Amino acid sequence: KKPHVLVIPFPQSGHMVPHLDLTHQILLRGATVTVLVTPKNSSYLDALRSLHSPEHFKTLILPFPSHPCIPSGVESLQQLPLEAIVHMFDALSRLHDPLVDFLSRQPPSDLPDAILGSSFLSPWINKVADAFSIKSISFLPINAHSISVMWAQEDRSFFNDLETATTESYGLVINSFYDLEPEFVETVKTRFLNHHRIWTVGPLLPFKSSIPPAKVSAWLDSCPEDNSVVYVGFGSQIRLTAEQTAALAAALEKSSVRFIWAVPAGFEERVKEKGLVIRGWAPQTMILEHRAVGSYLTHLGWGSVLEGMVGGVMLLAWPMQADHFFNTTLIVDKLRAAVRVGENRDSVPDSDKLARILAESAREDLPERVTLMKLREKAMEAIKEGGSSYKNLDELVAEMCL
Numbered sequence: 030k031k032p033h034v035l036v037i038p039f040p041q042s043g044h045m046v047p048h049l050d051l052t053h054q055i056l057l058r059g060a061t062v063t064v065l066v067t068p069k070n071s072s073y074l075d076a077l078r079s080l081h082s083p084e085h086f087k088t089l090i091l092p093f094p095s096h097p098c099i100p101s102g103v104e105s106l107q108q109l110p111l112e113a114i115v116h117m118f119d120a121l122s123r124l125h126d127p128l129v130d131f132l133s134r135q136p137p138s139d140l141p142d143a144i145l146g147s148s149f150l151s152p153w154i155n156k157v158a159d160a161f162s163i164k165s166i167s168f169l170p171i172n173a174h175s176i177s178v179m180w181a182q183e184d185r186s187f188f189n190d191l192e193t194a195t196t197e198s199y200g201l202v203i204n205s206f207y208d209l210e211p212e213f214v215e216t217v218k219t220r221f222l223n224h225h226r227i228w229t230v231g232p233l234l235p236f237k238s239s240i241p242p243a244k245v246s247a248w249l250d251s252c253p254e255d256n257s258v259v260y261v262g263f264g265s266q267i268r269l270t271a272e273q274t275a276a277l278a279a280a281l282e283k284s285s286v287r288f289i290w291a292v293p294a295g296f297e298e299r300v301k302e303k304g305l306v307i308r309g310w311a312p313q314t315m316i317l318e319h320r321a322v323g324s325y326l327t328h329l330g331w332g333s334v335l336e337g338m339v340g341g342v343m344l345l346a347w348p349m350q351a352d353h354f355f356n357t358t359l360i361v362d363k364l365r366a367a368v369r370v371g372e373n374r375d376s377v378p379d380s381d382k383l384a385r386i387l388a389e390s391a392r393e394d395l396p397e398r399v400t401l402m403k404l405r406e407k408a409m410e411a412i413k414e415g416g417s418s419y420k421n422l423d424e425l426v427a428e429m430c431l
């Protein structure tokens with residue numbers, strides 16, 4: 030009654046983390062999965078390997094194809110700039126043969142009932158899925174507003190093939206909920222999916238280095254009032270530059286509000302202690318869920334959009350690349366549930382007035398937050414039982430057996 034799924038995550042945070050958050054839901058619903066990864070991408074699957082026994086959860090590690098345009102020993106896009114994705118595509122394209130090989134050396138009672146790979150790797154995964162007559166289901170961590178804008182592009186490339194392949198797969202899973210953007214879910218379903226199969230599953234919630242995760246919780250607890258502090262983070266993988274940061278550090282100081290800000294390193298005077306600074310990894314989910322945070326200053330990634338939404342925080346947009354502008358269009362303009370605080374991928378706001386209206390989001394009852402809360406109620410209803418996404422998780426597992 031339960032399927033065997035072969036998942037193929039795309040090696041970058043934005044794709045990788047929700048992709049695995051999805052494989053948890055597949056397994057929670059009784060499936061057994063095999064995750065194909067590359068040697069240094071194995072750490073990702075550590076937590077998932079713990080929560081599920083070796084009978085139901087299996088790992089297929091293949092050596093990363095060597096590439097002249099990737100520096101040696103790099104296997105994910107955390108490290109390269111975003112413009113270097115097209116070589117990560119060709120590199121992993123070469124993973125095709127070993128997968129084909131591995132699957133052929135298999136008894137047909139071990140061959141999976143469906144492949145759940147990233148849509149970015151659909152071009153060759155779809156070629157595998159056909160050869161072995163397995164259903165290819167694609168995964169994207171972006172909302173359907175972005176997909177509808179992207180697929181409708183006339184010049185799509187170098188993204189064209191993955192968009193065509195995604196359009197030709199069995200169906201497509203995305204990390205959104207239906208009531209948020211039904212117009213665009215149906216756009217994609219009718220206009221860009223040959224078999225009109227689309228599963229909305231979000232918000233894919235996650236399951237459970239410079240400053241420990243516990244000492245930061247004591248810090249936050251040491252702050253009433255509730256929603257006092259602003260969390261400022263652009264994380265993996267968009268990095269800043271030294272002139273831009275001094276504009277932000279200046280904007281942060283003039284505001285006189287408590288903050289946290291995860292990343293000389295810059296600025297040179299850390300010493301004004303209403304806000305804390307974390308080098309490297311930070312426990313974002315726990316920070317944002319915490320009562321004391323009321324605002325997120327984010328590049329407006331979709332994963333951050335849903336994190337911030339679930340965490341019930343004021344969303345301050347500074348879109349820079351990838352889908353950030355599609356999200357800005359949807360969430361700030363079309364939905365008036367955020368507020369745009371930086372213009373451009375290389376914008377600088379004048380620190381002084383940026384400090385002004387960021388502090389005005391320590392009010393914090395700006396009607397942006399009230400708009401986003403009603404959005405969150407609908408997202409929560411979406412994932413709890415009977416909701417669009419929940420029911421979609423069920424039908425997706427159900428359909429892989431077919």
Ligand SMILES: O=c1c(O)c(-c2ccc(O)c(O)c2)oc2cc(O)cc(O)c12
Binds near residue numbers: 043113114115171175
């Ligand atoms: O929509 C996306 C997009 O346009 C690009 C992109 C943008 C500018 C470039 O110069 C480039 O090479 C790629 O990347 C992405 C990477 C993701 O993980 C998700 C996305 O949705 C996009």
